[PDB]
Design an enzyme around this catalytic site. Structure first.
Site, PDB file in Angstrom:
ATOM      1  N   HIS A 144     -15.627  -0.468   8.147  1.00 36.50           N
ATOM      2  CA  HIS A 144     -15.637  -1.738   7.428  1.00 36.50           C
ATOM      3  C   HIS A 144     -16.417  -2.832   8.163  1.00 36.50           C
ATOM      4  O   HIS A 144     -16.604  -2.774   9.379  1.00 36.50           O
ATOM      5  CB  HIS A 144     -14.201  -2.219   7.177  1.00 36.50           C
ATOM      6  CG  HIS A 144     -13.422  -1.353   6.236  1.00 36.50           C
ATOM      7  ND1 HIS A 144     -13.894  -0.993   4.991  1.00 36.50           N
ATOM      8  CD2 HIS A 144     -12.182  -0.814   6.338  1.00 36.50           C
ATOM      9  CE1 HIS A 144     -12.978  -0.272   4.367  1.00 36.50           C
ATOM     10  NE2 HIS A 144     -11.930  -0.149   5.162  1.00 36.50           N
ATOM     11  N   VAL A 183      -4.105   4.929   7.353  1.00 36.47           N
ATOM     12  CA  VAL A 183      -4.604   3.864   6.484  1.00 36.47           C
ATOM     13  C   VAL A 183      -4.583   2.523   7.226  1.00 36.47           C
ATOM     14  O   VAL A 183      -5.359   1.619   6.921  1.00 36.47           O
ATOM     15  CB  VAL A 183      -3.743   3.740   5.195  1.00 36.47           C
ATOM     16  CG1 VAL A 183      -4.222   2.564   4.339  1.00 36.47           C
ATOM     17  CG2 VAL A 183      -3.822   5.025   4.394  1.00 36.47           C
ATOM     18  N   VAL A 194       0.827  -1.197   0.000  1.00 33.24           N
ATOM     19  CA  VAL A 194       0.000   0.000   0.000  1.00 33.24           C
ATOM     20  C   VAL A 194       0.867   1.255   0.000  1.00 33.24           C
ATOM     21  O   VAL A 194       0.680   2.144  -0.834  1.00 33.24           O
ATOM     22  CB  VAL A 194      -0.973   0.023   1.224  1.00 33.24           C
ATOM     23  CG1 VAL A 194      -1.781   1.331   1.242  1.00 33.24           C
ATOM     24  CG2 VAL A 194      -1.917  -1.162   1.148  1.00 33.24           C
ATOM     25  N   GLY A 195       1.809   1.318   0.934  1.00 26.50           N
ATOM     26  CA  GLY A 195       2.696   2.466   1.022  1.00 26.50           C
ATOM     27  C   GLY A 195       3.454   2.769  -0.273  1.00 26.50           C
ATOM     28  O   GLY A 195       3.477   3.917  -0.721  1.00 26.50           O
ATOM     29  N   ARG A 232     -15.582   0.130  -4.486  1.00 28.68           N
ATOM     30  CA  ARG A 232     -16.012  -1.248  -4.743  1.00 28.68           C
ATOM     31  C   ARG A 232     -17.500  -1.329  -5.057  1.00 28.68           C
ATOM     32  O   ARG A 232     -17.913  -2.039  -5.972  1.00 28.68           O
ATOM     33  CB  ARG A 232     -15.695  -2.140  -3.540  1.00 28.68           C
ATOM     34  CG  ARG A 232     -14.234  -2.490  -3.406  1.00 28.68           C
ATOM     35  CD  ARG A 232     -13.954  -3.286  -2.146  1.00 28.68           C
ATOM     36  NE  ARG A 232     -12.539  -3.629  -2.105  1.00 28.68           N
ATOM     37  CZ  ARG A 232     -11.805  -3.656  -1.004  1.00 28.68           C
ATOM     38  NH1 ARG A 232     -12.348  -3.374   0.176  1.00 28.68           N
ATOM     39  NH2 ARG A 232     -10.514  -3.907  -1.100  1.00 28.68           N
TER      40      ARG A 232
END
Ligand SMILES: NC(=O)c1ccc[n+]([C@@H]2O[C@H](COP(=O)([O-])OP(=O)(O)OC[C@H]3O[C@@H](n4cnc5c(N)ncnc54)[C@H](O)[C@@H]3O)[C@@H](O)[C@H]2O)c1
Ligand SMILES: NC(=O)c1ccc[n+]([C@@H]2O[C@H](COP(=O)([O-])OP(=O)(O)OC[C@H]3O[C@@H](n4cnc5c(N)ncnc54)[C@H](O)[C@@H]3O)[C@@H](O)[C@H]2O)c1
Ligand SMILES: NC(=O)c1ccc[n+]([C@@H]2O[C@H](COP(=O)([O-])OP(=O)(O)OC[C@H]3O[C@@H](n4cnc5c(N)ncnc54)[C@H](O)[C@@H]3O)[C@@H](O)[C@H]2O)c1
Ligand SMILES: NC(=O)c1ccc[n+]([C@@H]2O[C@H](COP(=O)([O-])OP(=O)(O)OC[C@H]3O[C@@H](n4cnc5c(N)ncnc54)[C@H](O)[C@@H]3O)[C@@H](O)[C@H]2O)c1
Lengths: 295, 301, 295, 301
Positions: free
Chosen positions: D170, D113, D11-12, D146
């Site tokens: 989530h 994140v 991700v980073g 999504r």
């Protein structure tokens, strides 16, 4: 326009994603041997569409039947020389069963040989099959000159024929900053170093990451080539292709300046190299053509 | 990052629009002397934001107070030209404009576009009172662009891979260096006959006039606007790009004080470095003759 | 992909340039009646390629033979209702002589009628011919809401059917900021004003410039539509198309939500309008179908 | 504009690369705990600049002094998850990281994140000592993305025209508002059966797990990186965009102190406005239950 990227590791996945967002294709198929991985990465890429604003239909698979009728196929499969050659040969054979006339861009190493393997297997004309390396070597070199001079990488040009490592043929003569010869901006001493760093640039990344190779620069390079073909840009980039006389070499694949269009290699440029470089290019090609015999 | 563009004409507006979409600035001011035009073009541009996906606050004005505290100022104010022309007027315009903006912005970077370029840039710099690094003019990039597009046509290659070195100024003052002109590093002299190269060098030389004769009621603006922005982007994003721009020399090429179009490193501090490349006697000669002619008028003003 | 933009004034020229830089076409032909102008503008655009980094072959002409085999044709020709209808009809006829099956995007006003004129002239199926207006009205509305709320224009959505002026049907119901109903963010008082400003948005520009109309927003809108067709994006935009029953209207062109793909209008959406709006849409269509009779 | 990204993982790095190419920052620092990885990925990225045409100075480091005086900091440091998982560890990681950067940057805007998002954002904010406007977390944008991609698949329309409202967090804490979900403004309830909508709402809910089960050795990063950047771009370019992000409420939705994923206006000052939209009792109910659970752990820490 339907593109297929074989291999779902960092290189092929970074590549497919870039190809997805650039919208260079309507359909993009990411295929690999391991179950799950290709499906997850392609889905992750697709769910990126609403924020990155692209609508490329990106799907991951394990069935070559999903790569049927592909216009362009990027082969990044790899894991020795005899091993990979087999991997490449098999893959080529599987795609050729579902696509009668695509352009094949190889990214496996040893590049030149791997490209030959694929070509002679597909049965496609030498125009439809090419390999990637020069753009990448040029890119690393260009960035080193940029860091040295404190200028933009967009304005640095670097002509690099041959292959990786000792087989690399950097033409310092055709290397510049906005047209201004590097030779007038950087001492030959330092230029020699920057040329050395370029020969071992892939390894410099590997020595950092320990695991696996580099993939951003390699992926960006592959796309530049694919983009040229798709958008028929007629760009001139050093790619690995089967010569037919130029440079005093015939049949064997070499990294030379070429014009990439909708029909692939539309022209091979035979630039004016001095003996030294022209020799290293022929020796290197002999060694390569040597191996392409065993196979 | 606030950018002011003086002149809402074909060049000024096209330039402003491009700047807006590229989002290089948060606040973009389009000012003109004629009332209505800048406001209307500014609105038409902004109303483009939802489909072009940009949110730059483009404001059209007739008031200089709106340009206050600008970081970059692009001067395009001046009369273009009709088929059959080739400074007295614009000199006054450019100077009035420059002194006008300096009242509200005390340390901007001025990018002059108004013709005659070399001279109009001197006029602005002279009037601004800003160090020569903060004032430059746009010309080389455009000349180079045209030369590249021609070579591309001739060889059937991407314009991205063509590099063209062009110094000096427009017209007979244009010094195109075929020696530093290539296709992916490959010398053009190795791909195109000298005879044909000179013609392409000729087309380049009279490029603007070719556009003028077609349009008949004005000149080119698309390429000129694209070129100006390439320069501004370098400054805004501090890309340290190397582009041929009109700047005030200090000895390089055997020229002092006068503005000449030479390769320079463009950053947030403006001209961060002037490149004195290697030219043969014939080119240094023209470059210096031109330079004296320009240096002539400037003093005459 | 070969695109032709008829009309070299601000609208068609701003359009062609954008289409050139976006690389949505290999060949782009800018055609007009006046000698010189098209050739100069297209050249100015082309010489922009090396700095804007596109390689679209943009040429200006006066000979329709240069628009032969175009895939998409953008008609921006205009200079009364009987006059322009003749201009549009003639142009359509000239291109149909050099292209047997293109997609025609009309930008002349009155839009709906002008679009019909072109369609019935080309002889092409109603899927291959559409007009632009809704995207533009929506865009102006979206920007007003943005200025009001101090938010990004990317996050504002505006459903606008019908035509320009009194024939405009803004569905405040389907208008939002990130999905949040405008009705919950802006008073009906002010919403009424913003809706009014939208009906007279083209004129607001004209009242500023005095000479000619607006062209940036109008050009950007036309491209969004063309982009969807070229890249087969399947985008849903309010365009002027020949209905075939929906909204209780048949044959007459109306501005309704549609899905634009490689085959043009791939689907007409019959959203749920309330009587008021549904009425204004039918009256407006009657008036339009009325005029399409004289012609 | 200096941007630091803690964590050189999937991700980073993907995020850093994207930031580099988009040129949103002049200086981009990629720092990690493991030595070598950030340096190598940073170089690999920079060596991409000549072909991707960007000049961002991407530097990979293991030293926090290199992040000094940062404007925006993106925290992605933390262990992902394997098929079969669902905070004790990352809480310590995120806190160590936050206190570490605050020594060199005294007023950045932190974008968290690291999972569990809502809570990890609280941890950072708590540790930073920065006003709640300067600290936010990324989640909503990804969830929305999504949902949009699924509707697009279902209807065969561009993902650009699909809008999806999703608040909360989530999992079961995810509150997707079908009422504010549309296709070019048209309510999805008018284009897709309720029965099928719930399934798509289900896929969205377990979206991350669907990726995890495929990858098997890690989670998703492309969409997550794209979403984070959409947020950073808004801040950098002060686009005042309205995106669902995890922020610390002050009464809205009947929730105080705790971090919740709600629609917010993102600018250079961070959270410039929290939108309290209209939700029916059932949604306010979940949102508040979730909020209490989260508020539970946070204090337990
Ligand atoms: N052209 C260059 O200059 C250049 C630059 C970088 C890397 N490379 C080469 O590219 C390849 C990929 O690099 P990477 O970092 O992405 O590696 P990687 O190992 O992460 O990914 C390769 C993927 O290919 C898959 N694979 C292996 N055999 C396969 C087959 N027969 N069919 C389908 N999939 C198969 C693997 O399982 C793996 O997931 C390597 O061989 C590497 O040496 C070349
Ligand atoms: N450097 C290059 O390569 C290059 C390329 C193209 C044009 N140019 C020059 O740029 C200038 C503009 O070209 P154009 O096509 O945009 O012209 P134009 O006539 O369309 O626009 C010029 C605008 O300047 C405005 N103006 C005049 N005097 C002014 C004053 N005192 N203050 C504020 N605004 C004033 C006008 O009202 C007009 O809208 C000309 O001088 C032209 O020769 C240079
Ligand atoms: N769709 C919308 O909502 C919308 C928005 C703006 C403008 N428009 C309309 O678009 C048209 C163009 O606007 P503009 O600002 O570019 O105008 P303009 O007058 O600058 O350009 C139109 C060009 O078309 C040329 N022309 C006229 N008849 C022709 C024919 N038969 N063949 C070829 N060329 C011909 C003219 O000579 C002129 O150069 C106008 O009719 C205008 O009303 C529609
Ligand atoms: N918010 C979302 O929607 C979302 C989406 C995806 C992932 N995530 C979360 O983001 C995090 C990273 O995911 P990833 O896929 O990049 O993982 P990863 O394992 O690939 O990378 C995490 C990196 O953090 C580094 N790290 C660990 N502890 C550190 C410390 N104390 N200081 C500095 N660096 C440290 C590791 O060495 C590693 O390189 C996870 O917590 C994951 O659950 C959130």
């Amino acid at each position: 326009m339907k593109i297929t990227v074989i291999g779902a590791g960092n290189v092929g996945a970074t590549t497919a994603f870039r190809l997805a967002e650039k919208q260079l294709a309507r359909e993009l198929v990411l295929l690999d041997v391991v179950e799950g991985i290709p499906q997850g990465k392609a889905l992750d890429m697709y769910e990126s569409g609403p924020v990155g604003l692209f609508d490329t239909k990106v799907t991951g698979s394990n069935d070559y039947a999903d790569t049927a009728n592909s216009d362009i196929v990027v082969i990044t499969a790899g894991l020795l020389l005899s091993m990979n050659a087999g991997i490449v040969r098999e893959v080529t054979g599987r795609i050729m069963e579902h696509s009668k006339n695509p352009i094949i861009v190889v990214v496996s190493n040893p590049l030149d040989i791997m490209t030959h393997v694929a070509w002679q297997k597909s049965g496609l004309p030498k125009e439809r099959v090419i390999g990637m390396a020069g753009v990448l070597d040029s890119a690393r070199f260009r960035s080193f000159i940029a860091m040295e001079l404190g200028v933009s990488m967009q304005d640095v040009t670097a002509c690099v024929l041959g292959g990786h490592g000792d087989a690399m043929v950097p033409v310092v003569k055709y290397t510049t900053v906005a047209g201004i010869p590097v030779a007038d901006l950087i001492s030959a001493e330092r230029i020699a170093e920057l040329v050395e760093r370029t020969r071992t640039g892939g390894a410099e990344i590997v020595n950092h990451l320990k695991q696996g190779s580099a993939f951003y620069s390699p992926a960006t390079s592959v796309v530049e080539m694919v983009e040229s073909i798709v958008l028929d840009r007629k760009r001139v980039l050093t790619c690995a292709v089967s010569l037919d006389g130029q440079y005093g070499i015939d049949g064997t694949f070499v990294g030379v300046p070429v014009k990439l269009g909708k029909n692939g290699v539309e022209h091979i440029y035979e630039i004016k190299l001095d003996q030294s470089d022209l020799d290293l290019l022929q020796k290197s090609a002999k060694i390569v053509d040597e191996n392409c015999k065993m196979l």
